[PDB]
Amino acid sequence: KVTKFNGLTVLPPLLTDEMIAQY
Amino acid sequence: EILDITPCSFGGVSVITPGTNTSNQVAVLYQDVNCTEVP
Ligand SMILES: *[C@@H]1O[C@H](CO)[C@@H](O)[C@H](O)[C@H]1NC(C)=O
Ligand SMILES: *[C@@H]1O[C@H](CO)[C@@H](O)[C@H](O)[C@H]1NC(C)=O
């Protein structure tokens, strides 16, 4: 239900969605 | 001919280090870079 290259990077979160699901 | 232009691979460089108290060994993380672009 919940839906670039100019020095703009997106860092992945430390905890993956799988680890938050395990919590 | 139509040609896509993809910006040349770029990203931050991070240094994973234990304390200089522990060792001078470091790892290096090239953020969001495939291990082919890195020299
Ligand atoms: C860090 O290195 C210094 C050297 O000046 C030493 O005196 C200190 O005890 C060391 N600390 C640890 C936690 O190893
Ligand atoms: C890295 O590039 C290779 C081919 O050059 C490709 O097969 C692989 O999927 C790529 N991996 C990433 C994480 O971009």
User: DSSP alpha helices (H): ranges in A1-23?
Assistant: 17-22
**Method in brief:** cryo-EM
User: Quick one: resolution in A?
Assistant: 3.0
Note whether B29 and B13 are within 8 A (CB): yes
Beta bridge partners of B13: B30
Distance CA A9, CA B2 (A): 27
Give, using CA atoms, the residue closest to atom 11 of ligand 2. Answer: B34
Distance of CA A3 to the CA centre of its chain: 13
The answer to whether the Cβ–Cβ distance between A11 and B7 falls below 8 Å is no
The answer to whether the Cβ–Cβ distance between A7 and B10 falls below 8 Å is yes
Angstrom distances, CA of residue B3 to CA of A4, A15, B6: 19, 38, 10
